[PDB]
Amino acid sequence: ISASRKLQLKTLMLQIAKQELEREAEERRGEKGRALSTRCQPLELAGLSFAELQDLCRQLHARVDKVDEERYDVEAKVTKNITEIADLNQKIFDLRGKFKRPTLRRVRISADAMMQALLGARAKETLDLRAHL
Amino acid sequence: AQKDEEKMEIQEIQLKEAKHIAEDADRKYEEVARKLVIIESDLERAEERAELSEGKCAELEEELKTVTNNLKSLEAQAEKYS
Amino acid sequence: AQKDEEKMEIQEIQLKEAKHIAEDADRKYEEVARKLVIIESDLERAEERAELSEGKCAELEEELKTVTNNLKSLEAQAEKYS
Amino acid sequence: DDEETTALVCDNGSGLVKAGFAGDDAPRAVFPSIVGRPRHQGVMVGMGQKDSYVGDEAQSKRGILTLKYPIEHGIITNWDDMEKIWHHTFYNELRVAPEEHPTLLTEAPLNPKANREKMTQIMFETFNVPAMYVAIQAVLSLYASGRTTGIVLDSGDGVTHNVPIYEGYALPHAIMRLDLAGRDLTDYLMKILTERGYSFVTTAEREIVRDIKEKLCYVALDFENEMATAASSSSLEKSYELPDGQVITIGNERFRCPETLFQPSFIGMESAGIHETTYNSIMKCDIDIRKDLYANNVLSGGTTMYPGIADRMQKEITALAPSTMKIKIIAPPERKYSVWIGGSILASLSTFQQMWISKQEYDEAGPSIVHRKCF
Amino acid sequence: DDEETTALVCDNGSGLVKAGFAGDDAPRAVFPSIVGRPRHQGVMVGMGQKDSYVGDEAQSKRGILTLKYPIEHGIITNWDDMEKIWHHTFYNELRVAPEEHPTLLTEAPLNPKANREKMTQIMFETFNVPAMYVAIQAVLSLYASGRTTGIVLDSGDGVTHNVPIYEGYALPHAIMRLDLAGRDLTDYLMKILTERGYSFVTTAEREIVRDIKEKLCYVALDFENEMATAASSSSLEKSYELPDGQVITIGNERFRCPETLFQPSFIGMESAGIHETTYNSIMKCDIDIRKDLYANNVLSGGTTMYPGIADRMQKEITALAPSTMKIKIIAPPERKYSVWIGGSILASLSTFQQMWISKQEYDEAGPSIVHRKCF
Amino acid sequence: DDIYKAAVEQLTEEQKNEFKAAFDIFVLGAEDGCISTKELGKVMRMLGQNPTPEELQEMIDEVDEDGSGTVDFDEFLVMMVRCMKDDSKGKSEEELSDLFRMFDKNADGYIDLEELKIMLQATGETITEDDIEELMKDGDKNNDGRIDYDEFLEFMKGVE
Amino acid sequence: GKRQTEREKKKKILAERRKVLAIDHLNEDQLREKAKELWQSIYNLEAEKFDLQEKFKQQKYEINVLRNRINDNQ
């Protein structure tokens, strides 16, 4: 089997995925502008009457009311979704931790290092005992 | 001369420890060899029997389909009879 | 003292050889442990999948039995209503 | 990480004290727990003779000492000696003052309360640790295996106990603690060696018999066949060199010493072997978790290191258990230090960091705090 | 699918909650309705142990839980647990927020008003559905059969009720509700198993006895002949393997457990069996629609799935009824989900689309709106 | 290719002196200057840590494309520094989740054989028939016939 | 609680969100200018609302992924 070609495929597909993310973001921006222009029609009122000005202002106030209601509803829904996302993230983190935390530790850091410390102490014991004479 | 003899005794004990290491290593290695072989044989047999069961299950699926169709037929006949 | 120095150096080279044998055994041990862990994990998976297959085979067999018996009874009744 | 400090995972045990900082793989210092006063008179002046050699120092001067273990069966019978052992462990084998380190002792199940309370009182008053926590020796051995279920048989040197656990919920009504362990096997081996002529009596020669037991004894797969074979051939007789020469030859004493585990009638104990107390401990559990306990039987502790025990025990349980269940016996190669590895893992957890018995809490409720919520 | 809005056809039941979107053939998620708190202590830290496992999760950890059904006999006795069950059903088994979906609950006949009012108040305040409607569990089972007349015997797990209907006009004075159902049969089976030595006591082992009842029990065509045969031969003894081995052999307990349906004197109930309450329910109807009800007797509900009940019931009714009338018992193979299939059909109708209890209507009249025109 | 040459170009003489001291035992004399890779198996153990022997064989084979079995100080340097951890930050975990969301264009939450197969085909990369099954083993760690979040996460873990 | 609490909460948010409402009693030129300004304000609010809709879609799919992941344990 091959192993380096696996990494080559990974690198190429990751770059391709980044390109797809970029183009999808550009498509989202274009569609955002398109839908914004769709819902928000432009108006021009050159040489207008005061009564029609009041009618347009009242219609805009009603639009403000409805848009604020919709933004409030979507904000509350998104905040509940964010709380749920945090809860699910916490639970999955707890699962992963209880699965993998015992598996990480400092293996044989000093156990291998024990070469002659006890042996050195034993030899120096006899040396120190003989140092008296 | 006495210092050299002390050195010799130290070397002797270290050689003893080394042979001890050799023996314990061999023993554990033979043990793991036994476990390896037994595990491998049992894994082979288990895979074989599981695949056998899978085949039988697929055959049962087909049998059940046949029976379901025939029951549909008999039910239609009975209701028309009614 | 000269003889003792000779024995000292001989035991010294022997001790170095001992240490090298020890390290080789250690590496072999780590290796075999790795292998055993892998094969045992495979054993777990094999046994579990075998069990799944066996259970499904059991369930399908039972359902086949029930439906077959019902079909046979209704066939007898179809003749009766003839 | 950052501020803060490391925890001391001590593990008193009975026979070998194992200690080390939390988060490693193996205990830093492992040494027998014996304190031996000299017994002869002593004529050399100025030799610098101390009044009590503890730890591994008294296993080298054991020729003129009277070694005496301070822990008999899990419980501690001689508090001054145990305090001396702890002081040695902290100051000379680890060289870390206890004023700046939490400690995590371990205790056998079903032990007297006074032992645990005195342990915490010592740790808080004499050594003056910041916070200490006492944990059951079997839950740690279950941590080290990386499981979360299973019934663990922790046959130490003092006491053999068998704690079943499912999904993290321990079953307190199914703990079967039996007081046969490595020390009784040493005494029985020392008692059956007399059938060939070798007499070991002194408390120092008990160590020699322990070494014989460790290096030569093994558990027979089938007892009667081995007894018949050893009585006809001579392929079993293994020899061993005493600390002074005069090699000895052990015949069928090899597999008769550790056989006491499965037939405690040899040393006059009434109870059933470690092969049947596990099955009884399982049968006390609920009917729906018996399959998982059957499949995840865990071995731990030093005495379960006999060559050939993981097969004898499996054969016995398979004989007792229903024929359909699968019996599997987990016997990791790092059996001896399994409890301490589990202790290190538990002390290294973030979720556990608020379970320590903080010193101010002890000051408010006294030593009886250990039985309270902080278990 | 896409735009538009689909209805949620939930069906609380008692023993199995069945739910799914309107317009399909089978419920999307079917799981027992049990909420079980853990009962032991728990020693592993950080295992992520929750405080209550509901639904099908508590049928896998039932070894260390104390399962308790929140619905006793149709009525709901523990509102917090029922709210938990509903929350689980909406969010984890269907993953659709209730803010954008009408709901169609089901309720047994002759139930207390407060139960229904509390149900609608919960659905409108906590889950905040757009509109909910409560329907009688028997009319749906009549929908699923594609009929428009007939007397339906819906022997669930909580309560057995027998609603006769003609030409779409329900007869409110002829509903005979009897409280013997699958749960009492489980308890009686668990009580007669003790005659062979098998003792099941724990609330977890009630599930094992339920499995035995489902897989082995059957309804005898003639009771005395079966009792005589099972007492001489041994062709009936079927064995079954417990969740841990130790197979058991059920003798004449096989057809004695479900016989309680036709002789409620076994469990001490006074009333007559399901074979005679149907005939009584028919005889209360008018003299001119008795032939149609005789010819279109419908069976539904889980407990009517015993092998051989559609023949025993027909034999009994033919014995009771006049000799000229033809007795026919409709027993569709999809009996268990018949109520839910009917619920889906009813929710998918265009004519029904204006019968929902809209939220503004509830805001104007309070929870007592359910008893009003919007039934 | 020369990518790992660029990666190893970080370590200048500071570690090159130590590498030459280690490699001196390799060039022990009595040779014609070929300088094979024979000692490397224990040379990588000059400090103690050693990756998988299969990875060692891959390192032996992949460099020295002429198959000369000659280990230049540059290739020896790059292969030995590979023993030290070398990862280019592995994108970002949130970025990885976004990449998976792009991968799951079917909006199923899982990737099957055809999904990832077509995804790789869109790159135009030459893929063998001995492949595809290899990627199936790489992805179907649970052997459930699909790609879950964890399978992708460990699949792309530490790769950049 | 969602019978009086949520309705009063959203009514309070509506009441506070409203700015001053006295315009048309002024000179025509600044009136038209401020009308165009408020038209731009409405455009920005609608654009942000669409952004929040897309964010909600992404978060809903992420919550489905999380539900799948938590279900995969058994």
CSV table of N, CA and C in Angstrom, one decimal, chain D residues 93-211:
chain,number,residue,atom,x,y,z
D,93,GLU,N,13.0,9.5,50.4
D,93,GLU,CA,12.9,8.8,49.2
D,93,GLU,C,12.3,9.7,48.1
D,94,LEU,N,11.6,10.8,48.5
D,94,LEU,CA,11.1,11.8,47.5
D,94,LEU,C,11.7,13.1,47.7
D,95,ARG,N,12.2,13.5,49.0
D,95,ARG,CA,12.8,14.7,49.3
D,95,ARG,C,12.0,15.9,48.9
D,96,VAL,N,10.7,15.8,49.2
D,96,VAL,CA,9.8,16.9,49.0
D,96,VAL,C,9.0,17.2,50.3
D,97,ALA,N,9.2,18.4,50.9
D,97,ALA,CA,8.5,18.7,52.1
D,97,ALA,C,7.0,18.6,51.9
D,98,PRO,N,6.2,18.0,52.8
D,98,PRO,CA,4.8,17.8,52.6
D,98,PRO,C,4.0,19.1,52.8
D,99,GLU,N,4.6,20.2,53.2
D,99,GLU,CA,3.8,21.4,53.4
D,99,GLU,C,3.3,22.0,52.1
D,100,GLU,N,3.8,21.5,51.0
D,100,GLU,CA,3.4,22.1,49.7
D,100,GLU,C,2.9,21.0,48.7
D,101,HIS,N,2.3,20.0,49.2
D,101,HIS,CA,1.8,19.0,48.3
D,101,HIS,C,0.6,18.2,48.8
D,102,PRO,N,-0.5,18.1,48.0
D,102,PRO,CA,-1.6,17.3,48.4
D,102,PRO,C,-1.2,15.8,48.3
D,103,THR,N,-1.9,15.0,49.1
D,103,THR,CA,-1.6,13.6,49.3
D,103,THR,C,-2.8,12.8,49.0
D,104,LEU,N,-2.7,11.6,48.4
D,104,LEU,CA,-3.8,10.7,48.1
D,104,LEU,C,-3.5,9.3,48.6
D,105,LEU,N,-3.8,9.0,49.9
D,105,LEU,CA,-3.6,7.7,50.4
D,105,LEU,C,-4.6,6.7,49.9
D,106,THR,N,-4.3,5.4,50.1
D,106,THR,CA,-5.2,4.4,49.7
D,106,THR,C,-5.5,3.4,50.9
D,107,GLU,N,-6.7,2.9,50.9
D,107,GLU,CA,-7.2,2.1,52.0
D,107,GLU,C,-8.0,0.9,51.5
D,108,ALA,N,-7.9,-0.2,52.2
D,108,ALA,CA,-8.6,-1.4,51.8
D,108,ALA,C,-10.1,-1.2,52.1
D,109,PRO,N,-11.0,-1.9,51.4
D,109,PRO,CA,-12.4,-1.8,51.8
D,109,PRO,C,-12.7,-2.4,53.1
D,110,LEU,N,-13.8,-2.0,53.8
D,110,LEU,CA,-14.3,-2.6,55.0
D,110,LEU,C,-13.3,-2.5,56.2
D,111,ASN,N,-12.4,-1.5,56.2
D,111,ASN,CA,-11.5,-1.4,57.3
D,111,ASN,C,-12.1,-0.6,58.4
D,112,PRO,N,-11.5,-0.7,59.6
D,112,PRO,CA,-12.0,0.0,60.8
D,112,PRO,C,-12.0,1.5,60.6
D,113,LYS,N,-13.0,2.2,61.1
D,113,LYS,CA,-13.0,3.7,60.9
D,113,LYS,C,-11.8,4.3,61.6
D,114,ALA,N,-11.5,3.9,62.8
D,114,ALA,CA,-10.5,4.6,63.6
D,114,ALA,C,-9.2,4.6,62.9
D,115,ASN,N,-8.9,3.6,62.1
D,115,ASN,CA,-7.6,3.6,61.3
D,115,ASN,C,-7.6,4.8,60.3
D,116,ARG,N,-8.7,4.9,59.6
D,116,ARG,CA,-8.8,6.0,58.6
D,116,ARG,C,-8.7,7.4,59.3
D,117,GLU,N,-9.5,7.5,60.4
D,117,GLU,CA,-9.5,8.8,61.1
D,117,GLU,C,-8.1,9.2,61.6
D,118,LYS,N,-7.4,8.2,62.2
D,118,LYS,CA,-6.1,8.4,62.7
D,118,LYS,C,-5.1,8.8,61.6
D,119,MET,N,-5.3,8.1,60.4
D,119,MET,CA,-4.5,8.4,59.3
D,119,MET,C,-4.6,9.9,58.8
D,120,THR,N,-5.9,10.3,58.7
D,120,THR,CA,-6.0,11.7,58.3
D,120,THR,C,-5.6,12.7,59.4
D,121,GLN,N,-5.8,12.4,60.7
D,121,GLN,CA,-5.3,13.2,61.7
D,121,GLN,C,-3.8,13.4,61.7
D,122,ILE,N,-3.1,12.3,61.5
D,122,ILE,CA,-1.6,12.3,61.4
D,122,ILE,C,-1.2,13.2,60.2
D,123,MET,N,-1.8,12.9,59.0
D,123,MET,CA,-1.4,13.7,57.9
D,123,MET,C,-1.7,15.2,58.0
D,124,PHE,N,-2.7,15.6,58.8
D,124,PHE,CA,-3.0,17.0,58.9
D,124,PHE,C,-2.2,17.6,60.1
D,125,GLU,N,-1.9,16.9,61.1
D,125,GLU,CA,-1.2,17.5,62.3
D,125,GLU,C,0.3,17.4,62.2
D,126,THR,N,0.8,16.2,62.0
D,126,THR,CA,2.2,16.0,62.1
D,126,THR,C,2.9,16.5,60.8
D,127,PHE,N,2.5,16.0,59.6
D,127,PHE,CA,3.2,16.4,58.4
D,127,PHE,C,2.6,17.7,57.8
D,128,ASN,N,1.3,18.0,58.2
D,128,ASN,CA,0.8,19.3,57.9
D,128,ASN,C,0.6,19.5,56.4
D,129,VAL,N,0.0,18.6,55.7
D,129,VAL,CA,-0.2,18.7,54.3
D,129,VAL,C,-1.3,19.7,54.0
D,130,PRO,N,-1.3,20.2,52.8
D,130,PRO,CA,-2.4,21.1,52.4
D,130,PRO,C,-3.8,20.4,52.3
D,131,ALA,N,-3.9,19.2,51.8
D,131,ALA,CA,-5.1,18.5,51.6
D,131,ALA,C,-4.9,17.1,51.2
D,132,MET,N,-5.6,16.2,51.8
D,132,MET,CA,-5.4,14.7,51.6
D,132,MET,C,-6.8,14.1,51.3
D,133,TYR,N,-6.7,13.0,50.5
D,133,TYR,CA,-7.9,12.3,50.2
D,133,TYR,C,-7.6,10.8,50.2
D,134,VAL,N,-8.6,10.0,50.7
D,134,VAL,CA,-8.4,8.6,50.9
D,134,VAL,C,-9.3,7.8,49.9
D,135,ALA,N,-8.8,6.9,49.2
D,135,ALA,CA,-9.5,6.2,48.1
D,135,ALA,C,-9.4,4.7,48.3
D,136,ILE,N,-10.4,4.0,47.9
D,136,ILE,CA,-10.5,2.6,48.0
D,136,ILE,C,-9.6,1.9,47.0
D,137,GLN,N,-8.8,0.9,47.4
D,137,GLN,CA,-7.7,0.4,46.6
D,137,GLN,C,-8.2,-0.3,45.3
D,138,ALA,N,-9.5,-0.6,45.2
D,138,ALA,CA,-9.9,-1.3,44.0
D,138,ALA,C,-10.4,-0.4,42.9
D,139,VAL,N,-11.0,0.7,43.2
D,139,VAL,CA,-11.4,1.7,42.2
D,139,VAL,C,-10.2,2.2,41.4
D,140,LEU,N,-9.1,2.4,42.1
D,140,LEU,CA,-7.9,2.8,41.4
D,140,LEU,C,-7.4,1.7,40.4
D,141,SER,N,-7.4,0.5,40.8
D,141,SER,CA,-7.0,-0.6,39.9
D,141,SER,C,-7.9,-0.7,38.7
D,142,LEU,N,-9.2,-0.3,38.9
D,142,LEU,CA,-10.1,-0.2,37.8
D,142,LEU,C,-9.8,1.0,36.9
D,143,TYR,N,-9.4,2.1,37.5
D,143,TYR,CA,-9.0,3.2,36.7
D,143,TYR,C,-7.8,2.8,35.7
D,144,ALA,N,-6.8,2.2,36.3
D,144,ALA,CA,-5.6,1.9,35.5
D,144,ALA,C,-5.9,1.0,34.3
D,145,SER,N,-6.9,0.1,34.4
D,145,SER,CA,-7.2,-0.7,33.2
D,145,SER,C,-7.9,0.1,32.1
D,146,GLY,N,-8.3,1.3,32.4
D,146,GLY,CA,-9.0,2.1,31.4
D,146,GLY,C,-10.4,1.6,31.2
D,147,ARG,N,-11.0,0.8,32.1
D,147,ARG,CA,-12.4,0.4,32.0
D,147,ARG,C,-13.3,1.4,32.7
D,148,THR,N,-14.5,1.0,32.8
D,148,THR,CA,-15.5,1.7,33.7
D,148,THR,C,-16.4,0.7,34.3
D,149,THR,N,-16.4,-0.6,34.0
D,149,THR,CA,-17.1,-1.6,34.6
D,149,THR,C,-16.1,-2.7,35.1
D,150,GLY,N,-16.7,-3.8,35.5
D,150,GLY,CA,-15.8,-4.9,35.8
D,150,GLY,C,-15.7,-5.2,37.3
D,151,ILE,N,-15.3,-6.4,37.7
D,151,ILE,CA,-15.1,-6.8,39.0
D,151,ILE,C,-13.7,-7.1,39.3
D,152,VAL,N,-13.0,-6.4,40.2
D,152,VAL,CA,-11.6,-6.4,40.3
D,152,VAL,C,-11.2,-7.1,41.6
D,153,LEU,N,-10.3,-8.1,41.4
D,153,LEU,CA,-9.8,-8.9,42.5
D,153,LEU,C,-8.4,-8.4,42.9
D,154,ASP,N,-8.3,-7.7,44.0
D,154,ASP,CA,-7.0,-7.0,44.3
D,154,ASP,C,-6.3,-7.8,45.4
D,155,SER,N,-5.6,-8.9,45.0
D,155,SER,CA,-5.0,-9.7,46.0
D,155,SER,C,-3.6,-9.2,46.4
D,156,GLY,N,-3.6,-8.3,47.4
D,156,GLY,CA,-2.4,-7.7,47.8
D,156,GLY,C,-1.5,-8.6,48.6
D,157,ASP,N,-0.8,-8.1,49.5
D,157,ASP,CA,0.0,-8.9,50.5
D,157,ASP,C,-0.6,-8.9,51.8
D,158,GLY,N,-1.5,-8.0,52.2
D,158,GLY,CA,-2.1,-8.0,53.5
D,158,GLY,C,-3.5,-8.7,53.4
D,159,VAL,N,-4.3,-8.2,52.4
D,159,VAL,CA,-5.7,-8.7,52.4
D,159,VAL,C,-6.2,-8.7,51.0
D,160,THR,N,-7.0,-9.7,50.6
D,160,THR,CA,-7.6,-9.9,49.3
D,160,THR,C,-9.0,-9.4,49.3
D,161,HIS,N,-9.4,-8.4,48.5
D,161,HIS,CA,-10.7,-7.9,48.5
D,161,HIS,C,-11.2,-7.9,47.0
D,162,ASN,N,-12.5,-7.9,46.8
D,162,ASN,CA,-13.1,-8.2,45.5
D,162,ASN,C,-14.3,-7.2,45.3
D,163,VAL,N,-14.0,-6.1,44.7
D,163,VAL,CA,-15.0,-5.0,44.6
D,163,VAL,C,-15.6,-5.0,43.2
D,164,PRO,N,-16.9,-5.3,43.1
D,164,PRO,CA,-17.6,-5.2,41.7
D,164,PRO,C,-18.1,-3.8,41.5
D,165,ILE,N,-17.9,-3.4,40.2
D,165,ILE,CA,-18.3,-2.0,39.8
D,165,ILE,C,-19.0,-2.1,38.5
D,166,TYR,N,-20.1,-1.4,38.3
D,166,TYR,CA,-20.7,-1.3,37.0
D,166,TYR,C,-21.0,0.1,36.7
D,167,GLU,N,-20.6,0.5,35.4
D,167,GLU,CA,-20.9,1.8,34.9
D,167,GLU,C,-20.5,3.0,35.8
D,168,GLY,N,-19.5,2.7,36.7
D,168,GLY,CA,-19.1,3.7,37.7
D,168,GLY,C,-19.9,3.7,39.0
D,169,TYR,N,-20.9,2.9,39.1
D,169,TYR,CA,-21.7,2.8,40.3
D,169,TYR,C,-21.2,1.5,41.1
D,170,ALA,N,-20.5,1.8,42.1
D,170,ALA,CA,-20.0,0.6,43.0
D,170,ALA,C,-21.2,0.0,43.7
D,171,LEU,N,-21.1,-1.3,43.9
D,171,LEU,CA,-22.2,-2.1,44.6
D,171,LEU,C,-21.7,-2.4,46.0
D,172,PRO,N,-22.1,-1.6,47.0
D,172,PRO,CA,-21.5,-1.8,48.3
D,172,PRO,C,-21.9,-3.0,49.0
D,173,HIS,N,-23.0,-3.7,48.5
D,173,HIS,CA,-23.4,-4.9,49.2
D,173,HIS,C,-22.8,-6.1,48.6
D,174,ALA,N,-21.9,-6.0,47.7
D,174,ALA,CA,-21.3,-7.2,47.0
D,174,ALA,C,-19.8,-7.2,47.2
D,175,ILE,N,-19.2,-6.5,48.2
D,175,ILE,CA,-17.8,-6.5,48.4
D,175,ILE,C,-17.5,-7.7,49.3
D,176,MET,N,-16.6,-8.6,48.8
D,176,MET,CA,-16.2,-9.8,49.6
D,176,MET,C,-14.7,-9.7,50.0
D,177,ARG,N,-14.5,-9.3,51.2
D,177,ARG,CA,-13.1,-9.1,51.7
D,177,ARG,C,-12.6,-10.4,52.4
D,178,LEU,N,-11.5,-10.9,52.0
D,178,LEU,CA,-10.9,-12.1,52.6
D,178,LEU,C,-9.5,-11.8,53.0
D,179,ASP,N,-9.2,-12.3,54.2
D,179,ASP,CA,-7.9,-12.0,54.8
D,179,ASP,C,-6.7,-12.9,54.4
D,180,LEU,N,-6.9,-13.8,53.5
D,180,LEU,CA,-5.8,-14.5,53.0
D,180,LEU,C,-5.0,-13.7,51.9
D,181,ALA,N,-3.7,-13.7,52.0
D,181,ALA,CA,-2.9,-12.9,51.1
D,181,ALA,C,-1.5,-13.4,51.1
D,182,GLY,N,-0.6,-12.6,50.5
D,182,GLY,CA,0.8,-13.0,50.3
D,182,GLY,C,1.5,-13.4,51.6
D,183,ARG,N,1.2,-12.7,52.7
D,183,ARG,CA,1.9,-13.0,53.9
D,183,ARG,C,1.6,-14.4,54.4
D,184,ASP,N,0.3,-14.8,54.4
D,184,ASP,CA,-0.1,-16.1,54.8
D,184,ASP,C,0.5,-17.2,53.9
D,185,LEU,N,0.7,-16.8,52.6
D,185,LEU,CA,1.3,-17.8,51.7
D,185,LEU,C,2.8,-17.9,52.1
D,186,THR,N,3.5,-16.8,52.5
D,186,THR,CA,4.8,-16.9,52.9
D,186,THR,C,5.0,-17.8,54.2
D,187,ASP,N,4.1,-17.6,55.1
D,187,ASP,CA,4.1,-18.4,56.3
D,187,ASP,C,3.9,-19.9,56.0
D,188,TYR,N,2.9,-20.1,55.1
D,188,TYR,CA,2.6,-21.5,54.8
D,188,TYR,C,3.8,-22.2,54.1
D,189,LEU,N,4.4,-21.4,53.2
D,189,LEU,CA,5.6,-22.0,52.5
D,189,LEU,C,6.7,-22.2,53.5
D,190,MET,N,6.9,-21.3,54.4
D,190,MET,CA,7.9,-21.5,55.4
D,190,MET,C,7.6,-22.7,56.3
D,191,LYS,N,6.3,-23.0,56.4
D,191,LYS,CA,5.9,-24.2,57.2
D,191,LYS,C,6.0,-25.5,56.5
D,192,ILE,N,5.8,-25.5,55.2
D,192,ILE,CA,6.0,-26.7,54.4
D,192,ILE,C,7.4,-27.0,54.0
D,193,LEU,N,8.3,-26.0,54.0
D,193,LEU,CA,9.7,-26.3,53.7
D,193,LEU,C,10.3,-27.2,54.8
D,194,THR,N,9.7,-27.2,55.9
D,194,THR,CA,10.3,-28.0,57.0
D,194,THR,C,10.2,-29.5,56.7
D,195,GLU,N,9.4,-29.9,55.7
D,195,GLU,CA,9.2,-31.3,55.3
D,195,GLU,C,10.4,-31.8,54.6
D,196,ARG,N,11.4,-31.0,54.2
D,196,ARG,CA,12.6,-31.5,53.6
D,196,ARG,C,13.8,-31.3,54.5
D,197,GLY,N,13.7,-30.5,55.5
D,197,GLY,CA,14.8,-30.3,56.4
D,197,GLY,C,15.2,-28.9,56.7
D,198,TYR,N,14.8,-28.0,55.8
D,198,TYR,CA,15.1,-26.6,55.9
D,198,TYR,C,14.2,-25.9,56.9
D,199,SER,N,14.8,-25.3,57.9
D,199,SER,CA,14.1,-24.7,59.0
D,199,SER,C,14.4,-23.2,58.9
D,200,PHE,N,13.4,-22.3,58.7
D,200,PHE,CA,13.5,-20.9,58.7
D,200,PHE,C,12.6,-20.4,59.9
D,201,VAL,N,13.2,-19.7,60.8
D,201,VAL,CA,12.5,-19.3,62.0
D,201,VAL,C,12.6,-17.8,62.3
D,202,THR,N,13.8,-17.3,62.1
D,202,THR,CA,14.0,-15.9,62.5
D,202,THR,C,13.2,-15.0,61.6
D,203,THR,N,12.8,-13.8,62.1
D,203,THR,CA,12.0,-12.9,61.3
D,203,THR,C,12.8,-12.3,60.1
D,204,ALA,N,14.1,-12.5,60.1
D,204,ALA,CA,14.9,-12.1,59.0
D,204,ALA,C,14.8,-13.2,57.9
D,205,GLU,N,14.7,-14.4,58.3
D,205,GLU,CA,14.7,-15.5,57.3
D,205,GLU,C,13.3,-15.6,56.6
D,206,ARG,N,12.3,-14.9,57.2
D,206,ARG,CA,11.0,-14.8,56.5
D,206,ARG,C,11.2,-14.1,55.1
D,207,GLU,N,12.2,-13.1,55.1
D,207,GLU,CA,12.5,-12.5,53.8
D,207,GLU,C,13.1,-13.5,52.8
D,208,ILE,N,13.9,-14.4,53.3
D,208,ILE,CA,14.5,-15.4,52.4
D,208,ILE,C,13.4,-16.3,51.8
D,209,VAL,N,12.5,-16.7,52.7
D,209,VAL,CA,11.4,-17.5,52.2
D,209,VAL,C,10.5,-16.8,51.3
D,210,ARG,N,10.3,-15.5,51.5
D,210,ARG,CA,9.6,-14.7,50.5
D,210,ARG,C,10.2,-14.6,49.2
D,211,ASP,N,11.6,-14.5,49.2
D,211,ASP,CA,12.3,-14.5,47.9
D,211,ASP,C,12.1,-15.9,47.2
